[PDB]
Write a protein that binds this ligand. Structure first.
Ligand SMILES: [K+]
Ligand SMILES: [K+]
Ligand SMILES: [K+]
Ligand SMILES: [Mg+2]
Ligand SMILES: [Mg+2]
Ligand SMILES: [Mg+2]
Ligand SMILES: [Mg+2]
Ligand SMILES: [Mg+2]
Ligand SMILES: [Mg+2]
Ligand SMILES: [Mg+2]
Ligand SMILES: [Mg+2]
Ligand SMILES: [Mg+2]
Ligand SMILES: [Mg+2]
Ligand SMILES: [Mg+2]
Ligand SMILES: [Mg+2]
Ligand SMILES: [Mg+2]
Ligand SMILES: [Mg+2]
Ligand SMILES: [Mg+2]
Ligand SMILES: [Mg+2]
Ligand SMILES: [Mg+2]
Ligand SMILES: [Mg+2]
Ligand SMILES: [Mg+2]
Ligand SMILES: [Mg+2]
Ligand SMILES: [Mg+2]
Ligand SMILES: [Mg+2]
Ligand SMILES: [Mg+2]
Ligand SMILES: [Mg+2]
Ligand SMILES: [Mg+2]
Ligand SMILES: [Mg+2]
Ligand SMILES: [Mg+2]
Ligand SMILES: [Mg+2]
Ligand code: NA
Ligand code: NA
Ligand SMILES: [Zn+2]
Lengths: 123, 53, 55, 53, 51, 81, 50, 203, 118
RNA sequence: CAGACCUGAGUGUGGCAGGACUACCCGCCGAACUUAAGCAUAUUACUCAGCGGAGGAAAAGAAAACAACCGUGAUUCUCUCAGUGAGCGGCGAGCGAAGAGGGAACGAACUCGUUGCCGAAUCGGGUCUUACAAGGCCUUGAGUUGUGGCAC
RNA sequence: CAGUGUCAAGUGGCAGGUAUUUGUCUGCCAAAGUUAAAUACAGAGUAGGAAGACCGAUAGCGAACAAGUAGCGUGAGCGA
RNA sequence: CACGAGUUGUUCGGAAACUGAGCACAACGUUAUAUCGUUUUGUUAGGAAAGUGAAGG
RNA sequence: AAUUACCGAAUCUUUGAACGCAAACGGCGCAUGGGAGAAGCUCGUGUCAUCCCCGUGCAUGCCAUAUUCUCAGUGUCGA
């Protein structure tokens, strides 16, 4: 049983060491399942499995965040792996952006300035 | 509009000592050969189905 | 809520005596009143460049 | 290859058929010395480049 | 009516040549430069029967 | 004779399991499926059997990804700070 | 016979594991509705044919 | 400008020089594939008036179609039913060859958007059209205000729905008023409008 | 012009630049020391298995069904520090994979069994 | 001689298409049962079945339009026009619309080509300003077999 | 509207619901393109809601239940 | 019917690794529509489908 | 919190349009990056041949592009 607050404090090398210890502990409990085992011993299987999941969650969350920052530089963002890019939706990725939309010709731009829409009232 | 008519039923015709009502096709179930498509048959269509107009 | 519209006469000999609202004001009417059509389109006046003003 | 064969056969066919004067006038061209002089003059009066502009 | 046998044979199907045992088509040499201008000499190696 | 005696003459099988749809409808000799037309890219769909269409359409299975993307759309693709 | 693809063998293995009765403690749950497996299969009654 | 001379010249297709040029071109086209990519249009004036521009993202293809009337595809030329539906050879397709060529190109190349097409040549067996297409993923196209409307997904495969000029021609949308009342906004729409039974609440 | 000696034209030989290695598209963290625990699942304690321990210096395990004999030998060394001279495998009718692992004469299967906890 | 242009190839780099859904919508293809107290034109029906293609709606849409008036004014939809003293039809069975009028909606209009005056002022790619700027600088790379600007 | 043959004009052209030739008159300017709302959802879907002079376990969807399940057919399919 | 067990391979059969009656991916053509046709009589396709022996420093 | 509700961070086996090649085969490749290695070599270490395991890329078609990549043509020129 490991608290999430302590795990985020540990380093990558420390986390990998703890992952091996819990994996070894779980293997010994599977042996108890095959033979006869006390009910108290068998009740420890679930907490061990959930502790392993927490360690892997912290490792993977840290690794993704570092790589996103590494590729954030303009010189490397053109080669970002597709798993690190935003997903959104297939159609939304190919649609026109707000900047690509709203493009205007010079004549249209000058007309909008010459005759802007007004606010008025009638008495 | 589809209630009671969602079967591929057909009449067996005369020559078999049964009524000429359409009957469910197939086999292997308790509904095989049972009557269908009729206001008097169990699971059949009602007479003059109600409309919304 | 609704823009300003002109007054027109209904066609044919059956509705000759009736009046109603048309699509928009003509450029000749706008010029007689002293308005640029493009400017008038921005202060809630409808413009129609097809009507003829035959009388 | 097909494109080689076709680009040769096109020239053969153009020579074989009968050519109207409007197209034929482009076959008879200027002399080599006059062409060289004209190209020298054109190069002397060539337009400016992007960097120069 | 139904299709006649002579017309049915034109589809192929089970009416094609039984050619599994055959040795191949029989033909002369290719008419080449040597045949057009001089001559070529060959040797008969075997004489065989074809189904 | 046709009937009972001829039922004992039936050996082998015409169809086996299909890799794509899982039914016992893959024709062994012709190497194509009678239910989904595998290995053709598209599947069988005919309007003369709407009942068969309703048995195979979207929503009759798991929708592992469609459930997730439906949630993101409904929340306008929310992301943290 | 002796021959079978490994994929076929795994399908038969899963059907062997499903051919079991309901555990007795299931009937004691609150709101239980299950009495028998109702999908038990016997090799002489119904054929799987795969 | 030069456009007037080119346009006036292309109105003399029966003159000797034009017939000579067209014969050479038709002979050359007869020995090529059904679909060909071109670097530049054969008729620049026509292409530009139909919407082509010399910019990155535009491309031109030449497409071949076969001439003649439609043969009804029934087994051994045998029909069934009433004698009114027994013709096999004298029926005609209700869609024109220009639209057919556009649809062929569009179905073959799914990453492009078809814009328009024009007649280029013709012989006894074949007709040739040139089709203009754009690439919706090109930055020039996406940022050009005059063409970027075609990037929107509502214009995908617009030639398969008869929305080009030839499609409009064979749908009959060249006419208005009393010559097109029964086919506007479409035949099916007018049919629904004239045939649905109406039940007012208080009747 | 060039001289050709064959009756048909074939494509000429041109320069080809080799492809470059892209950044890896998988970024999940994997550990090397964890792998052996996946190969070996748990031992068996049936009557047939117990007879082999005393009489043949052999152990019985349930293993990953996609593992091969070579990997099982390495995992046994890494987990229990014993040398296996022969591995025999079979896939049970219930879908699991079983392995009879014979230990070398330098080790005693009974001693190893006690350390595991049989 | 080298070289150039034109027309075609190979490879590297960055992208896109095939599938699913298909109630409504757009394009094609396309029956027969049935009615006519028989039946072949006709009707069922420009429907069912078949083949393609999009969206949240689609399609249509800014007059080579109505009218014949004291004239109206892009498209779509509703009542009515009208089961019609229109019209089609073994003029049989049957079929069958449009203008006008009262309304819903509506800030509703714009862009090329051509003509006249200009003529790379254009695009893409690197690099720099917090920035893949509607920005500066540099680029033969594309482009004069014409990108772009100003008036109709 | 489609196939084939033939194939224009130049402020002149197109439309004015009976064919042709000849004069007037009225309206408009085809053969390139974009565009919201009012309209459909007649066996779709996602996230939420509101109701009924309707049915009440042989009824109402085939399915108020481990229901497109058990079972049948070589198969398309059938189906409690 | 219930509970618990049982199938061990360098050499056995298959595949890795042959060809046959034959099939039909690519390519090309046709079709309003590819879900059509051609594809062993030495043999695809108007057809540029061969990617490494030696070398040489 | 082995409570529930919601959601932004994650995991996500074999397949399937399925796309390295095939397929009643949990089969077989090329390139590249790693891992383990009871042989041999070397001073319990290090190193490692054959064998074995893992990640990534490799279908066809089309568009753009090459700090201006490599080529073909009794096509048109030129020196
Ligand atoms: K040539
Ligand atoms: K498209
Ligand atoms: K040359
Ligand atoms: Mg009922
Ligand atoms: Mg033969
Ligand atoms: Mg069997
Ligand atoms: Mg034809
Ligand atoms: Mg018929
Ligand atoms: Mg077509
Ligand atoms: Mg109307
Ligand atoms: Mg074995
Ligand atoms: Mg009927
Ligand atoms: Mg009758
Ligand atoms: Mg009768
Ligand atoms: Mg009759
Ligand atoms: Mg009709
Ligand atoms: Mg239909
Ligand atoms: Mg639209
Ligand atoms: Mg009345
Ligand atoms: Mg009718
Ligand atoms: Mg100009
Ligand atoms: Mg211009
Ligand atoms: Mg439009
Ligand atoms: Mg009951
Ligand atoms: Mg019921
Ligand atoms: Mg039993
Ligand atoms: Mg048992
Ligand atoms: Mg042959
Ligand atoms: Mg063979
Ligand atoms: Mg071959
Ligand atoms: Mg594959
Ligand atoms: Na032979
Ligand atoms: Na006929
Ligand atoms: Zn299948």
């Amino acid at each position: 049983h490991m608290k999430i607050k302590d795990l985020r404090e540990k380093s990558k090398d420390d986390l990998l060491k703890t992952l091996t210890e819990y994996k070894k502990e779980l293997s010994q409990l599977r042996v108890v399942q095959q033979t006869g085992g006390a009910e108290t011993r068998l009740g420890r299987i679930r907490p061990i499995r959930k502790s392993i999941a927490r360690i892997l969650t912290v490792l993977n969350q840290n690794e993704r965040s570092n790589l996103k920052m590494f590729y954030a530089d303009r010189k490397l963002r053109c080669k970002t792996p597709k798993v690190l890019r935003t997903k959104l939706t297939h159609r939304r990725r190919l649609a026109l952006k707000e900047n690509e939309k709203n493009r205007k010709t010079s004549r249209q731009m000058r007309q909008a300035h010459k005759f802007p829409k007004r606010v008025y009232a009638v008495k | 509009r589809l209630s009671g008519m969602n079967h591929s039923a057909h009449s067996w015709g005369t020559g078999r000592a049964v009524a000429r009502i359409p009957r469910i096709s197939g086999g292997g179930t308790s509904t095989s050969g049972a009557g269908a498509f009729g206001n008097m048959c169990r699971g059949g269509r009602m007479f003059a189905p109600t409309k919304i107009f | 809520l609704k823009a300003l519209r002109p007054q027109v006469n209904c066609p044919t000999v059956r509705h000759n005596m009736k009046r109603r609202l048309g699509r928009g004001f003509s450029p000749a009417e706008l010029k007689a009143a002293g308005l640029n059509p493009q400017y008038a389109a921005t202060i809630g006046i409808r413009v129609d460049s097809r009507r003829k003003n035959k009388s | 290859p097909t494109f080689v064969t076709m680009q040769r056969k096109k020239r053969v066919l153009q020579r074989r058929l009968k050519v109207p004067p409007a197209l034929n006038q482009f076959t008879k061209v200027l002399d080599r010395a006059s062409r060289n002089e004209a190209l020298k003059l054109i190069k002397k009066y060539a337009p400016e480049t992007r960097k120069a502009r | 009516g139904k299709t006649v046998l002579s017309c049915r044979k034109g589809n192929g199907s089970v009416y094609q040549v039984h050619g599994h045992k055959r040795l191949g088509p029989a033909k002369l040499r290719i008419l080449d430069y040597a045949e057009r201008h001089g001559y070529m000499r060959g040797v008969v190696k075997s004489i065989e029967h074809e189904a | 004779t046709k009937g009972t005696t001829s039922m004992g003459q039936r050996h082998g099988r015409t169809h086996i399991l299909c890799r794509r749809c899982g039914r016992n409808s893959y024709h062994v000799q012709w190497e194509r499926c009678a239910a989904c037309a595998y290995p053709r890219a598209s599947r069988r769909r005919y309007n003369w059997s709407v009942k068969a269409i309703k048995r195979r359409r979207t929503g009759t299975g798991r929708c592992r990804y469609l459930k997730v993307v439906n949630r993101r759309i409904a929340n306008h693709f929310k992301t943290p700070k | 016979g002796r021959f079978k693809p490994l994929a076929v063998k795994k399908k038969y293995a899963k059907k062997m594991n499903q051919n079991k009765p309901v555990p007795y403690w299931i009937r004691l749950r609150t709101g239980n509705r299950i009495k028998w497996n109702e999908k038990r299969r016997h090799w002489r009654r119904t054929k799987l044919n795969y | 400008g030069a456009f007037m001379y080119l346009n006036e010249l292309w109105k003399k297709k029966s003159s000797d020089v034009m017939r000579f040029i067209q014969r050479i071109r038709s002979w050359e086209f007869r020995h090529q594939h059904t679909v060909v990519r071109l670097r530049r249009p054969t008729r620049p004036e026509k292409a530009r008036m139909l919407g082509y521009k010399t910019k990155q993202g535009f491309c031109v293809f030449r497409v071949r179609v076969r001439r003649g009337g439609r043969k009804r595809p029934v087994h051994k030329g045998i029909t069934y039913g009433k004698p009114k539906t027994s013709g096999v050879l004298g029926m005609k397709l209700n869609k024109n060859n220009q639209a057919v060529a556009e649809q062929r190109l569009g179905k073959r190349f799914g990453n492009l958007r078809v814009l328009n097409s024009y007649w280029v040549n013709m012989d006894s067996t074949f007709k040739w059209y040139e089709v203009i297409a754009v690439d919706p993923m090109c930055k020039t196209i996406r940022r050009d205000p005059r063409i970027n409307w075609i990037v929107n997904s509502v214009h995908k495969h617009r030639e398969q729905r008869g929305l080009t000029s030839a499609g409009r021609k064979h749908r009959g949308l060249r006419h208005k008023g009393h010559k097109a009342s029964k086919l506007r906004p479409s035949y099916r729409a007018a049919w629904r409008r004239n045939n649905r039974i109406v039940f007012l609440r208080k009747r | 012009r060039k001289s050709y000696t064959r009756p048909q034209f074939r494509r000429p030989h041109t320069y080809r630049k080799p492809a470059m290695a892209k950044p890896s598209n998988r970024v999940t963290v994997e550990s090397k020391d964890i792998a052996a625990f996946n190969v070996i699942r748990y031992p068996l304690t049936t009557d047939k298995a117990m007879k082999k321990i005393e009489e043949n210096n052999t152990l019985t395990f349930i293993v990953d069904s996609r593992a091969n004999k070579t990997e099982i030998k390495k995992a046994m060394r890494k987990l229990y520090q014993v040398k296996a001279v022969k591995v025999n495998t079979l896939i049970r009718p219930d879908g699991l994979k079983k392995a009879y692992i014979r230990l070398s004469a330098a080790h005693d299967a009974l001693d190893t069994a006690n350390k595991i906890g049989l």
